[PDB]
Structure of Capsid protein VP1:
Amino acid sequence: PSPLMGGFGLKHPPPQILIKNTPVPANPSTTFSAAKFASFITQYSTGQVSVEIEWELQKENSKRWNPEIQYTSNYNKSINVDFTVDTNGVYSEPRPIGTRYLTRNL
Amino acid sequence: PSPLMGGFGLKHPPPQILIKNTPVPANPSTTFSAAKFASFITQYSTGQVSVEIEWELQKENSKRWNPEIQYTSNYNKSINVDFTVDTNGVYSEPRPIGTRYLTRNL
Amino acid sequence: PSPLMGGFGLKHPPPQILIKNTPVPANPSTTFSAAKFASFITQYSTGQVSVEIEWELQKENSKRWNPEIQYTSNYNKSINVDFTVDTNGVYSEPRPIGTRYLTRNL
């Protein structure tokens, strides 16, 4: 049960966190009406969210002699630096980065 | 006093280790001669040498966002692998490798 | 490593203190949009800042007989007093003041 899109299969994954604004009714009628409220004060919410994850690492213990392939930035000059913002302050991710750079014997 | 060729300047560097074969005189004359010995048994020595050095590391503590330049092997196919032996078993070092790949602010 | 512009060279100088206003998003769309927020409530902040520095003094211990040069205000009358505000309440510093007025032997 490893996900086909990639990742860790969890029988009990991190739970869904559901958030919504409590409806605030607008001005009601002075006469009682059994119809459910359909007029509300327009509102939204803003705030900060923090996620902290602890990860366990499996340290490489290779005994190969020659150097390995490593992910690296390209030294040549460029208009924009990779994984930074441009003159519009727009953050971009130039390429997908996997994890399989070190080598291990079968 | 940093060496100009590169490295660590030491007022008391690792001492020189001097080794030589003890001269074994060849067959002497049965009559005493005050002349110093000039005939010796031809000989050499072979053995194993072990050097173990402990190095202290200064761990990188960078806060840059985008990836850094790292030394890496080239993925493209080649006749010979870098820093290995060839079909003659001759070890070669294809290029000089420095140490200055990570970055730190001034 | 004394700064060429003048002052004290510090390997660990007083740290930079960074302050910014937390962005408060404006009214969002009732339909989900994956585009990052570009509309915010215009706002600024005001407040008070306090800096307290303790300085150590090296007391003069001279044995010269005749009086020394000292920095002084000029007694003659003037339209404006030095290092005060003018009729517009604008504070000005009329001249640069150094620190080298007392004398010591070589």
